[PDB]
Amino acid sequence: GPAFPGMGSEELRLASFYDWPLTAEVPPELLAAAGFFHTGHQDKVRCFFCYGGLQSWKRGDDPWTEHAKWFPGCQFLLRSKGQEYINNIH
């Protein structure tokens, strides 16, 4: 099961990005879709399922790609994107 079930809703995750500092650079819509919510501190986000945290986002970073890069064992990632997608990033 998810590490943080309360952030399992994509809509709730999107709402967390109201004061996201990097709107143009990495869209909240893509971050929320990829399982991440904004902690509210700097550009630190966390996945609701694996609880993996990512920060120091660079312009044009792709949330799903970074999810797979750093947390390839996440079951939300696997269910959403499939194993082939994860394997290809590695």
Partner: peptide, 4 residues
């Protein structure tokens, strides 16, 4: 991005 990087982990924290």
């Amino acid at each position: 991005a990087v982990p924290w």
